[PDB]
Amino acid sequence: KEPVRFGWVKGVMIRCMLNIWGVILYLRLPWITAQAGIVLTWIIILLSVTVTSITGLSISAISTNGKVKSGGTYFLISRSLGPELGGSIGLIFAFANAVGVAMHTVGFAATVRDLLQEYGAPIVDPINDIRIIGVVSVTVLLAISLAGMEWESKAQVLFFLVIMVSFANYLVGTLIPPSEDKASKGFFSYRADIFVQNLVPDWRGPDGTFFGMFSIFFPSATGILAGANISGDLKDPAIAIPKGTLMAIFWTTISYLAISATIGSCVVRDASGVLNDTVTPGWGACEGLACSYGWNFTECTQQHSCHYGLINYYQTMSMVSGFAPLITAGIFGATLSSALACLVSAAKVFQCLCEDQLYPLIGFFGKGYGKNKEPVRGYLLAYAIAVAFIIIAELNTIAPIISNFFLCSYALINFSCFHASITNSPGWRPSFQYYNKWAALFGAIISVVIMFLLTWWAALIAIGVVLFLLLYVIY
Amino acid sequence: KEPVRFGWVKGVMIRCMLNIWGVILYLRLPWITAQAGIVLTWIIILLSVTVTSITGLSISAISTNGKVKSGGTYFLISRSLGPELGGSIGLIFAFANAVGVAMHTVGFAATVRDLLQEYGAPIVDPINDIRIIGVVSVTVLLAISLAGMEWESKAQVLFFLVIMVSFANYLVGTLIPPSEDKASKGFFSYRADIFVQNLVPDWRGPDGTFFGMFSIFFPSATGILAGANISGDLKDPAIAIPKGTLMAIFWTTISYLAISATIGSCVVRDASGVLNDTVTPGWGACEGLACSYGWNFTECTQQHSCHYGLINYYQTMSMVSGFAPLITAGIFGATLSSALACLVSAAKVFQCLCEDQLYPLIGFFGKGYGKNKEPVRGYLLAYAIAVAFIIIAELNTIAPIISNFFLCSYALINFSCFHASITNSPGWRPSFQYYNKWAALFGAIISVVIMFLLTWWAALIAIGVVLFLLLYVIY
Ligand SMILES: CN1[C@@H](CSCC(F)(F)F)Nc2cc(Cl)c(S(N)(=O)=O)cc2S1(=O)=O
Ligand SMILES: CN1[C@@H](CSCC(F)(F)F)Nc2cc(Cl)c(S(N)(=O)=O)cc2S1(=O)=O
Ligand code: NA
Ligand code: NA
């Protein structure tokens, strides 16, 4: 019985798009489109995908240099800068993936808890819901992923169709002439007067700054290494990984642009929500854009004390849509898919690190064979860390450190491509057309600049952990 | 004719105390003693001298390992971590010393300009005074230092006696019962009631924070490598450098403690300066500590709008003193001595780098022999940079970068001592008693933590310059 291999659509493209897409697409992008306007949000998106396209070109070059087993993303780091950084960056990549599993399972459990709190009775605790649901969900994900990889691929296809159904739902919803309940909350159909007004920024609050929007959005656009972490499970990686990875980046970027430019042309930033703010003939005069449509939000705007509209309501995308439960289904398929992708990625990197003769730090973890063609000893190690960080359940002070563990890998991958190309390393002959050393160097510099520019003490902790591991291995 | 050698008093101790002592001793320490109180200022001082004592122990260990020529402070960095960091850290040490020459000559020229603006007519420009005076002063310093090193040593002894005379002046001044002019500005003799009141903090203003006081004070306590940069000009460095360096640190620390604890027991933080704030019998009641001595500063304290007292007047030390011109003489001897020490240090490191066969980057600078036993080609290179940065004359936005160039050297010296001691390097047998690897490691970590904690973008620029030099040498 031969093992199973995947094509470039179900092996690289679907996985990369599903790992890129998260809950920012549903819960924060329409709000970023309000704080910053349409054109400046487009600039945010295009500045964020510039780093990931350069990293994608370095990854595509690495893939056209030979055959690499699954989880060997750090082999060029260890081959170009020594096996003590390579193993340490591999061990920190695999740990960040396992903590990302917990950060996505917590996000799924929060949605389920909010869903339960509205329909019926919860359990006695408000925050132990997030713990029980998180543990049961990660155990179900572990079961499906440990039952083979065809089942994991079928689950990923299910999540992809759920997300496409949510997109079609929202797009049909924006085309229906408004009802009273929608129009009172700020939704008007595609209008020429709302497109123009929403093009320019309107900053409000403590985080209402261009750098704050960049900080919220940038970490969500990463996730382009999901198809390259299973390179040994593909029919032919040297054609699959470049094409799939770059098509995934292109199409997620187009979806991000279309959603912002269409939400910004339908919903005004301020609305009351109550049904008796229609025009009263002879009410002197009213101020606001919606007056010409028949609504009066003057009291809100003057007092700044109502909770609807594009800039006040985080759930505006769910109400523009034709049927609201399908957006919740999309959120489920967007968080579970990323948790599953991160779990598979962490398991395979851990399994590659446990069988590394040049990095013998953690090779002692295996006692039972677990020879069922699956990384059982990398699955249990990822599951243990994921459950431990789910029990904590408060992960918003740990997210910067985990997100800098991912930019250290980006910096070292790009610099290893540059260092191997300028030194004429003996055995580095990439055949990808659109690769160039100076682009890789720029990516390596920008990754570290962004690392320190997001939060400097988290960057210090990340580099300190890398250094402690590297020096403990040497001594 | 043999060359001249110096003992441990005139070669290490005087030079180190004169480079440590600057203008913070005269113009900012009495104000730090007001913002933070006596005990918390003592904590500031003892936390700052903890880093420099550990670095002094590493330097003393380096000095008891053989004979090193003058300027070879980076030889252990290059011997323990490769000749591409050693030369780069040497080249950045020598450049920071030459910029420090300009930062001290500008401080001398500012004092002379203020002195001239009060007595007579200046030249037509207010800021070109600082340029003409700076250039002429650095040329005179270059002349005396290029005329041999006995003359430089005699100038240093002159500066030391001037500083001691200023200290005796101030200490006699604090013991004289107050006059009307002094008592009106806030000076009362040693009182028990003012010691107690001044022990606890009183924060005011934007920089009135413990971290702000630390930021102002810490960079001034460094300067402990002035006696180790001329190690090849001493009778026997292996006994001279440890004893002199540690005695210098000890005595400058004791002077810093005594000045703060005696200025804090004499001057109240708020005073008016005008002579008719004495007690009027029957003026209801007055609020403040000085009332029991016969003065009334209620209007000031309520309105926060007068310019005398320990926390408002930067020149309080000059008015407590018996004769005021001697404090200005002390300021002259405190800035010129540091400029001369930095110029000699930069010249000798540049001359050691120009004769290095393992770091051939700048060995091309020498055409004329200049064989008069003096680093002529390291003197002219230091003089050119000093004059170029004096012409700019605005150096308070460059000081953080230059001050991080000095903490990078501290971090790499300490880490090179640790790395050589744990690896059992072949030829590293220090015979200093009070050396220990873990103290050196702690010093190396604390230096980088402080580097990033003072100002993170300046630390990024410093590490980026080091990295650019290191990588340009490798490729
Ligand atoms: C959305 N993710 C962000 C981190 S944001 C949440 C945080 F972890 F920061 F808390 N970065 C990456 C990067 C990669 Cl490369 C991969 S992956 N599976 O391709 O290797 C996965 C992720 S992610 O899914 O965790
Ligand atoms: C008072 N100085 C501070 C820097 S504060 C002013 C700034 F430069 F930051 F702008 N640090 C050092 C360190 C050393 Cl080691 C030496 S020296 N001659 O021993 O090598 C001299 C100096 S300093 O005199 O420049
Ligand atoms: Na997803
Ligand atoms: Na001095």
Swiss-Prot record, chains A, B:
Binding-site list for Na(+): L18, W21, A334, S337, S338
Tissue occurrence: Predominantly expressed in the kidney (at protein level). Localizes to the distal convoluted tubules (at protein level). Not detected in normal aorta, but abundantly expressed in fatty streaks and advanced atherosclerotic lesions (at protein level).
Outcome of mutating F93A: Reduced sensitivity to thiazide diuretics
PTM comment text: Ubiquitinated; ubiquitination is essential for regulation of endocytosis. The BCR(KLHL3) complex was initially identified as a candidate ubiquitin ligase for SLC12A3. However, it was later shown that it is not the case. Phosphorylated in response to IL18.
Sugar-modified residues: N276, N296
Binding positions (polythiazide): N19, N97, H104, T222, N229
Variant or mutagenesis effect after changing G309S: In GTLMNS; does not affect MAPK1/3 (ERK1/2) phosphorylation in response to IL18
Localisation: Cell membrane; Apical cell membrane
Segments on the Extracellular side according to the record's topology features: 114-125, 174-208, 264-323, 393-397
Effect of N312S: In GTLMNS; 68% residual Na(+) uptake activity; partial loss of localization at the plasma membrane
Disulfide bridge partners, by residue number: C286-C291, C300-C306
Impact reported for H104 to A/Y: Strongly reduced sodium and chloride ion cotransporter activity
Subunit structure: Homodimer; adopts a domain-swap conformation at the scissor helices connecting the transmembrane domain and C-terminal domain. Interacts with KLHL3. Interacts with IL18R1; this interaction is increased by IL18 treatment.
Function, in words: Electroneutral sodium and chloride ion cotransporter, which acts as a key mediator of sodium and chloride reabsorption in kidney distal convoluted tubules. Also acts as a receptor for the pro-inflammatory cytokine IL18, thereby contributing to IL18-induced cytokine production, including IFNG, IL6, IL18 and CCL2. May act either independently of IL18R1, or in a complex with IL18R1.
Entry's free-text remark on domains: Interaction between the cytoplasmic N-terminal and C-terminal domains (NTD and CTD, respectively) is essential for SLC12A3/NCC transporter activity. Phosphorylation by OXSR1/OSR1 and STK39/SPAK may activate SLC12A3/NCC by facilitating this interaction.
Family: Belongs to the SLC12A transporter family.
Name of the molecule in the record: Solute carrier family 12 member 3
Species in which this protein is naturally found: Homo sapiens
Taxonomic placement: Eukaryota, Metazoa, Chordata, Craniata, Vertebrata
